């Protein structure tokens, strides 16, 4: 609205500052403690209410993070607490707020609401309408970013549909339709191949002559994602290559006698693999946009020889699916909403794994520590796998956050074959950091394969365990 420009005097605070949260939380907890201590007993009859108030304190049951709080009233020996004295205490909370300005929004129904998460009998109910699909916030009237950054929001739609228990065959199938709709733009026009989206964490359906609906969307993104499905499908892929004239004379240690370079160049798998690593940010004009477009077209015109040094160093490791692990939680227990035996794959993964019920400095010091070279402490100690294996930029993905990756890394990924020691998988006593990366390379395929998460054992490293990590050290020298 033009001609609308003024100033205004309030007593309120700014909306989203940082220090405006902490002191409000302190002020929440202090007034709740003096409620339960002093104002409580001094303003009520009905000694059931008095006995209820004198039994709880805010260290034992009160949790607050902002304006909102959650107070928990535990069960006694006789069962649950009488649900009428709780309401008589609720009226006293509402009366207590009026004496100094707070207008509480107390609620008592039998559920729990805290940080806008909805539970009933321990339920994990997702709010599907918390974020819409076709909805985006715009505060100003300015134009938006150019075209090749819309795919980040499309992947955001997909990863937000992951955490909510959608019908997974329908959800992946609709994600493909969006994924293929947002792929071409006028500038020869620009176009992403379909493998560039597989790099971004999007699972597939049926490729290379395989079974349909064969992988899961719990697969990671990046090189750890590209390792897993290839290492699961590889003896079928090397058959499908030879199935139409893609034979060379020498045998590769990975794909055998088939020219993976020509097959991947003609099918444009390499070009999607390297084209997905281009920056989608038009960093600091239409001519910079044209610079980014020419940089993006150059990756499509260039023909490629192999994958990155990290993925090629990964692909020498072979695992095995011997036997399924014992379950971690009851099948008939409703843990999480939406997922059920009708939603088959998360229902299998969440029972077999179990739900979670229990940076530049850290990078570069490990870069200089693993290569031959607090600062006096780091040299000999070790950290866990999820911290020690960040030296090759491996991270537990966004998808595995609502599961138990700790027990899976610690126990159910064995770095030793079932029939003893194959003499090929001999990690030296020196350079024992390799174990923390082999944990991730093991736990990739045990999560990408649909169905039950299976106990996985080490089988083979082709170049030897000593010569395996020299490739990682070459990547560390090359940065």
């Amino acid at each position: 609205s033009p001609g609308n420009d003024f100033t205004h005097m309030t007593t309120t605070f700014p909306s989203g500052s940082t220090a405006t949260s902490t002191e409000h939380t302190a002020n929440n907890s202090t007034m709740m403690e003096t409620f339960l201590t002093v104002w409580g007993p001094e303003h009520t009859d009905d000694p059931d209410v008095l006995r209820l108030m004198k039994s709880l304190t805010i260290q034992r049951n009160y949790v607050c993070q902002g304006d909102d709080g959650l107070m928990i009233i535990d069960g006694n020996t006789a069962g649950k607490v009488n649900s009428e004295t709780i309401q008589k205490m609720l009226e006293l909370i509402s009366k207590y707020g009026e004496e100094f300005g707070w207008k509480y929004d107390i609620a008592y129904d039998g559920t729990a609401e805290y940080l806008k998460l909805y539970f009933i009998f321990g339920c994990r109910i997702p709010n599907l309408s918390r974020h819409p699909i076709v909805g985006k916030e715009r505060a100003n009237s300015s134009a938006e970013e150019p075209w090749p950054a819309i795919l980040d929001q499309i992947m955001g739609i997909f990863f937000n549909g992951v955490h909510d228990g959608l019908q997974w065959q329908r959800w992946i199938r609709y994600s493909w339709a969006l994924c293929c709709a947002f792929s071409r733009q006028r500038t020869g026009y620009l176009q992403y191949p379909m493998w560039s989206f597989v790099y971004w964490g999007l699972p597939l359906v049926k490729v290379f002559g395989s079974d349909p609906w064969i992988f899961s969307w719990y697969m990671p993104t990046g090189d750890l994602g590209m390792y897993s499905w290839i290492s699961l499908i590889r003896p079928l892929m090397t058959r499908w290559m030879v199935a139409n004239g893609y034979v060379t004379d020498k045998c590769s240690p990975v794909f055998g006698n088939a020219d993976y370079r020509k097959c991947f160049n003609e099918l444009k798998l390499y070009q999607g693999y390297y084209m997905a690593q281009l920056p989608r940010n038009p960093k600091k004009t239409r001519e910079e946009l044209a610079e980014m477009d020419e940089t993006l077209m150059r990756a499509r015109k260039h023909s490629y020889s192999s994958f990155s040094k990290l993925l090629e160093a990964y692909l020498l490791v072979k695992w095995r699916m011997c036997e399924a692990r014992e379950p971690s939680v009851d099948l008939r227990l409703p843990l999480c909403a939406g997922i059920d035996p009708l939603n088959s794959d998360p229902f299998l993964k969440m029972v077999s794994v179990g739900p979670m019920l229990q940076n530049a400095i850290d990078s570069a010091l490990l870069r200089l520590r693993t290569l031959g070279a607090l600062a006096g402490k780091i040299m000999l100690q070790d950290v866990n796998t999820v911290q020690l294996a960040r030296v090759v930029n491996l991270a537990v993905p966004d998808t595995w956050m609502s599961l138990d990756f700790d027990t899976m890394f610690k126990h159910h990924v064995k770095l030793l074959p079932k029939d003893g020691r194959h003499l090929n998988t001999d990690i030296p006593p020196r350079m024992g950091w390799l174990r923390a990366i082999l944990r991730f390379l093991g736990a990739g395929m045990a999560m990408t394969a649909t169905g039950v998460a299976v106990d996985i054992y080490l089988e083979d490293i082709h170049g030897g365990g000593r010569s395996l990590g020299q490739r990682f050290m070459t990547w560390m020298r090359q940065e």
Binding site: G75, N76, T77, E326, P327, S328, V329, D330, G354, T407, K410, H411, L416, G420, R421, P429, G432
Partner: protein
């Protein structure tokens, strides 16, 4: 459930996971007992209710004889030369007095 409500203590396996951390072993050997016990002490279906059921069964031997299931015995015989069967002997020899 009533004994779980009235009882002052509570089970906590982090005592075991803390006391296994300061063990003395080498990373050259092909098997490690301190990491075998932490695998063997995670129960199937992750329920701990059988302890309080065994305490409640003391009130009833005349109609109920609480015994240990056949699936906890080491797969129709085990060797004393195998370490997992030593741990499986330990677990049973401690569980049987209740």
């Amino acid at each position: 459930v009533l004994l779980q409500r009235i009882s002052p203590l509570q089970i906590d396996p982090t005592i075991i996971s803390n006391t296994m951390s300061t063990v003395s072993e080498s990373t050259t050997q092909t098997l490690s007992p301190a990491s075998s016990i932490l695998g063997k002490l995670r129960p199937s279906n992750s329920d701990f209710s059988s302890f309080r059921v065994a305490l409640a069964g003391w009130l009833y031997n005349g109609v109920v004889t609480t015994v240990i299931d056949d699936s906890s015995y080491p797969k129709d015989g085990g060797s004393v030369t195998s370490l997992e069967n030593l741990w499986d002997f330990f677990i049973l020899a401690l569980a049987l007095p209740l």
